[PDB]
Amino acid sequence: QKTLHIYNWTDYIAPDTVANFEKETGIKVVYDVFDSNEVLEGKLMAGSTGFDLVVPSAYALERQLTAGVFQPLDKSKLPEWKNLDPELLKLVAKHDPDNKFAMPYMWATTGIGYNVDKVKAVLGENAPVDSWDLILKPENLEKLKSCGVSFLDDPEEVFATVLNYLGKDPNSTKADDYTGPATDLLLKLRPNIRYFHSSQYINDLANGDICVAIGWAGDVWQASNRAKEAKNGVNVSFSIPKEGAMAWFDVFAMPADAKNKDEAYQFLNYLLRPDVVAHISDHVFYANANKAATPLVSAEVRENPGIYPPADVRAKLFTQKVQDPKIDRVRTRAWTKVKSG
Ligand SMILES: COCCOC[C@@H](C)OC[C@@H](C)OC[C@@H](C)N
Ligand SMILES: [Cl-]
């Protein structure tokens, strides 16, 4: 009896995906979760994770490759690899040349999740729900403080969105951008932010406990779906703001010391099956990278422009750059200053 260990994001799989895999293959699966790239990268850099598959973002995969923490995917053991989107593969290939190490899993954006009715009650029906002004303008955050504001606990996301909102390069390589105007705005916003967290905001949005969040798109639509299932009358939506937004790709990768490579390949081939990965998108409200699976995804998910955004919305998106150690230092320092007010 072999056991496959999988380290994935929270709220990032269907409730029966793993059980259906165990039944089909006889492989026992141990499934652990994280809600942060730095948590996952920390384990990948510090020692032996014990995981056979992990799921980092494509840009973070690039940093991890330079340390040799992954092993190349044997394409002959992934016969269904052809189901993956070539335009999505080419986008991942900027971080993983020739797509040698990673399998694109899901992709989405980083925008604003919000309580529609409470926002409209606090800021009126003309609230800037189409703009980052909703959560990055201090005059607005001062009004929304009491209903609850959350930011992701992710320095790269927050700083990229703040610099973009200030008219700077989202991936600015000038330290004065981070210590100056980026830190200045965050400190003005900081007293109105209830907490920095990358997963608690899902149930807090669903229950009406926070009214505006920096959120990952599928996370927020899950919040909206849970509230509807609970019949609590809470109205949650998601905005890809008109100023542009962070877009990203999460990929499956195989750690270089993975114990059960053969079983890991079996799970990757399982994920490549169109019905399997469409079932996941139906439940997590995330776009998968499987071109063959798209028609099998629910109309509710596929026709949602906040999940499968149209071309006008795609033209506004930017992706995360791997910053050199100088900018990494500056950004990380300012982030810690910001978290402690
Ligand atoms: C409470 O969770 C029990 C998991 O049960 C797995 C079910 C679906 O069957 C698949 C089995 C035969 O394969 C893996 C075995 C070794 N655990
Ligand atoms: Cl990415």
Author numbering: 29 to 369
List sentences quoted exactly from the publication behind this structure.
To gain insight into the evolution and designability of ligand binding and specificity, we analyzed the homologous PBPs, PotF and PotD, which are Escherichia coli putrescine (PUT)-binding protein and spermidine (SPD)-binding protein, respectively. They constitute the first elements of two separate multicomponent uptake systems (PotFGHI and PotABCD) to transport the cationic polyamines PUT and SPD across the cellular membrane. Still, the protein-binding modes differ: PotF shows affinity for PUT and SPD, whereas PotD exclusively binds SPD. Prior to this work, we grafted the seven differences in amino acids from PotD binding pocket onto PotF; this resulted in PotF_SPD, which will be referred to as PotF/D throughout this work to keep naming for mutants more concise.
We introduced the S247D exchange into PotF/D and into our high-affinity constructs E39D–Y87S–F88Y and E39D–F88A/L. The combination of S247D with the other constructs led to an affinity improvement with which the nanomolar range was reached for the first time, while keeping the order of affinities in the different mutants the same compared with the prior analysis. We successfully obtained X-ray data for all newly generated variants including the F88A carrying construct. All structures but PotF/D–S247D adopt a fully closed wildtype conformation. The orientation of the residues in both mutants is identical, confirming the F88L containing variant as a structural example for the noncrystallizable F88A construct in the first part of this study. An interesting feature of the F88A containing construct is the orientation of the N2 of SPD, as it faces toward the aromatic box residues to form stacking interaction in contrast to all other constructs, in which interaction with D278 is always preferred. The F88A containing structure is less resolved than the others, and the ligand density could allow for both conformations of N2 in the density, but multiple refinement cycles ended up preferring the built one. In all constructs that carry S247D, SPD adopts a “relaxed” conformation and does not show unexpected bending of its backbone to fit a specific position as it does when being bound by PotF wildtype or PotF/D.
